[PDB]
Write a protein that binds this ligand. Structure first.
Ligand SMILES: O=c1ccn([C@H]2C[C@H](O)[C@@H](COP(=O)(O)O)O2)c(=O)[nH]1
Ligand SMILES: O=c1ccn([C@H]2C[C@H](O)[C@@H](COP(=O)(O)O)O2)c(=O)[nH]1
Lengths: 284, 288
């Protein structure tokens, strides 16, 4: 009798939102059921990797998006050319015009995650400019702090710059990240302002857990926990029936994740460096 | 009798860190016992106000500091004139020289919380420059969104600007704030990267709860919850015996907080606008 306690908690969180969450409208007039303020822990020990089993997660998308974020790119065509189309809808001529971004060419999302991570505070012009050496490279500064002052309680990476809100196709959801080191293990906490529990959360858990493994590898630490903290945790009313069905499913054990190469630095990671062992989701 | 569950939870979290926390040295050279990633909820309904009762919290400090944060000031002397001296250590001639801020005058804290709340992204020169209408006024933007777009999932106020870290004595601890409105009630979640469970947390909880009450009051909403999320939650080793004492005390019911006049905007509050009803704390506890 194996119990995947972490995935069960996630299912219980869906149930609680479904049964007791408050009705709320989203910014398109569509309805959700919502709660405010949740926190969930995922153990990364023994290579165990919290990819959800009760509905298949788009792992190839998680990996490629993340390596794209780390590169500092803001051009969704660079993802799309790798057959990952998740940012295509928010970088169309038409969507960009609806955001008032008339001078962005198709693919230009403005200064979204990767730009904030690697170039915080640099003025944005477009996705083709070279920003190398410009702004604050928070990602490298976090890595330096991990290696040089692991006790530090200031190991932070922010994606939230209100001065950039009018320049972005959409405002960041995964807003704030902190790292922590104790007893030779690296942990990460991420703060997510708004989380769709059905479609967003599972992919989010996987991106940050994978970032945690990456950083622990190139800082010579063992992985500890990923902590996910949410502001508005919600499910869309139109999803409620499908999620009820998912909730009848019995979670299976999490896969494991190995890193296959001695990677030089955070910018040297390649998709083939990661091996996902025994991922066995139900459909979807 | 009455059971103060939120205060018992705090005491239980103290117990947990003390009994099961990892030993971790720190910047200060004192060691800590530490856990990473905690979350606690405080109910603000029926005017109940989460000021801890197992020790006397520095309420007058909480109120004056928050009014001073709201003003956008970065001059500790403006707080010191209110006989609240908690920022004086970090703004002495002597102390600033040590962080290599030789050009700041005494009292100049750099762009700490108030500057970030009212003037985010404006370049900082000194505490005496005119910042009026410069930078991004996050606090008033959050107020406007609560009034105009209460359903929004983007009501955010950040205090974290990597470009400003080398300009302040100490980087902000209470970093990130989100507001939320549902069924006519305003809630607030605050993310704290670093929390001294003895000396800081009780004060910190009172600070954000009070901010939530203030905003609820000017937006004609009911107060809902304050949710406190922490990164590194720690106790200093030197504090443990004193916290041991505190943990044997039986929490009392929280006080109520009343606001005594109609206030229309965030900058218009005075210290005397707030009335604590029936705060019955045990005596103060001193900790290095
Ligand atoms: O990484 C993400 C990005 C978005 N969303 C969901 C949350 C909301 O349902 C919607 C974003 O809408 P706003 O919070 O910005 O209104 O997308 C996620 O769950 N994860
Ligand atoms: O509002 C505050 C400010 C500071 N601290 C504590 C946390 C740490 O013990 C110390 C700051 O040190 P660093 O985390 O910056 O090292 O002050 C608080 O708890 N609350």
């Amino acid at each position: 009798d194996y119990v995947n306690q972490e995935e069960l908690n996630y299912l219980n969180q869906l149930k609680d939102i479904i049964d007791h969450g408050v009705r709320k409208n989203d910014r398109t007039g569509i309805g959700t059921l919502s709660t405010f303020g949740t926190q969930s822990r995922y153990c990364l020990r023994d290579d165990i990797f919290p990819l959800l089993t009760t509905k298949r997660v788009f792992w190839r998308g998680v990996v490629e998006e993340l390596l794209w974020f780390i590169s500092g790119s803001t051009n969704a065509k660079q993802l799309s050319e790798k057959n990952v189309n998740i940012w295509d809808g928010n970088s169309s001529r038409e969507f960009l015009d609806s955001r008032g971004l008339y001078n962005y060419e198709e693919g230009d999302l403005g200064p979204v995650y990767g730009f904030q991570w690697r170039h915080f505070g640099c003025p944005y012009s477009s996705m083709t400019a070279d920003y190398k050496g410009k702004g604050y490279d928070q990602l490298q500064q976090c890595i330096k702090m991990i290696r040089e002052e692991p006790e530090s309680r200031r190991i932070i990476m922010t994606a939230w710059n209100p001065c950039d809100l009018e320049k972005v196709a959409l405002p960041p959801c995964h807003c704030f990240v902190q790292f922590y080191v104790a007893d030779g293990e690296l942990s990460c906490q991420m703060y997510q302002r708004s989380a769709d529990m059905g479609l967003g959360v599972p992919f989010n858990i996987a991106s940050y857990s994978l970032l945690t493994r990456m950083i622990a590898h190139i800082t010579s630490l063992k992985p500890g926990f990923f902590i996910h903290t949410i502001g508005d945790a919600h499910v869309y009313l139109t999803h409620v029936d499908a999620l009820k069905v998912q909730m009848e499913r019995k979670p299976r054990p999490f896969p494991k994740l190995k890193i296959l190469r001695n990677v030089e630095n955070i910018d040297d990671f390649r998709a083939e460096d990661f091996e996902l062992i025994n991922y066995k989701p139900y459909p979807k």
